[PDB]
Scaffold this active site. Structure first.
Site, PDB file in Angstrom:
ATOM      1  CB  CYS A  76      36.924  39.960  45.004  1.00 53.14           C
ATOM      2  SG  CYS A  76      38.271  41.008  45.663  1.00 53.14           S
ATOM      3  CG  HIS A 163      38.536  35.206  43.437  1.00 49.37           C
ATOM      4  ND1 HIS A 163      37.823  35.728  42.386  1.00 49.37           N
ATOM      5  CD2 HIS A 163      39.240  36.256  43.969  1.00 49.37           C
ATOM      6  CE1 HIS A 163      38.067  37.031  42.280  1.00 49.37           C
ATOM      7  NE2 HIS A 163      38.945  37.380  43.219  1.00 49.37           N
ATOM      8  CD  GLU A 165      35.974  33.197  41.164  1.00 47.77           C
ATOM      9  OE1 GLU A 165      35.576  33.012  42.403  1.00 47.77           O
ATOM     10  OE2 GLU A 165      36.269  34.322  40.715  1.00 47.77           O
TER      11      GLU A 165
END
EC number: 6.3.5.2
Length: 188
Positions: A76, A163, A165
């Site tokens: 990001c 994202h 993660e």
């Protein structure tokens, strides 16, 4: 071990946790950590530039993006900082809140080995890459964002708007794993 530059975002520890789930050690460091200190540690195989709130408060990342020889992944803000460092453009966009976004892979490269062509990702789109830098290519897009992912055409420098993660991103750990494979890790 992967070094994670902490750009102040809420998912920094999620990067560490997710990498652990695939057996990769990582260390969260200040975003002011000088490049020489990162690359002289022979345990360091790659660099992640995390998300965060303030593109003005993560400049040392521009130097890192430009001058590191290790592979780099930006997430990001990280992706946006890579774009700015290589002379691309970044700006505000409409869909600011975090939401599930259907991403379309245009070039498998890598990030998207063993990932389906279409997948849902957790993403905000408060800011985005408006103009890919010269010498980069787009890897993925969504309905509302032309640049969901990109990479340098020949250097191991990668950016994702979303994202990987967090759990809401389908195949997120496989995206991370592909970057770690570029870093020299091996996975059964």
């Amino acid at each position: 071990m992967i070094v994670i530059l902490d750009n102040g975002g809420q998912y920094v520890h999620r990067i560490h946790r997710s990498l652990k789930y695939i057996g990769v050690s990582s260390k969260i460091v200040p975003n002011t950590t000088p490049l020489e200190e990162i690359e002289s540690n022979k345990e360091v195989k790659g660099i992640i530039l995390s998300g965060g709130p303030d593109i003005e408060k993560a400049k040392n990342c521009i130097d890192i993006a430009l001058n590191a020889k290790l592979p780099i992944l930006g997430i990001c803000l990280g992706h946006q900082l890579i774009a700015l460092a290589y002379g691309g453009e970044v700006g505000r966009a409409e869909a600011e809140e975090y939401a599930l976004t259907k991403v379309y892979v245009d070039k498998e490269n890598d990030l998207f080995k063993n990932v389906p062509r279409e997948f849902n990702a957790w993403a905000s789109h408060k800011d985005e890459v408006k103009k890919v830098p010269e010498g980069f290519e787009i890897l993925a897009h969504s309905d509302i964002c032309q640049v969901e992912a990109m990479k340098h055409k020949t250097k191991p420098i990668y950016g994702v708007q979303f994202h990987p993660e967090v759990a809401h991103t389908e195949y997120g750990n496989e995206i991370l794993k592909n970057f770690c494979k570029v870093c020299g890790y091996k996975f059964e």
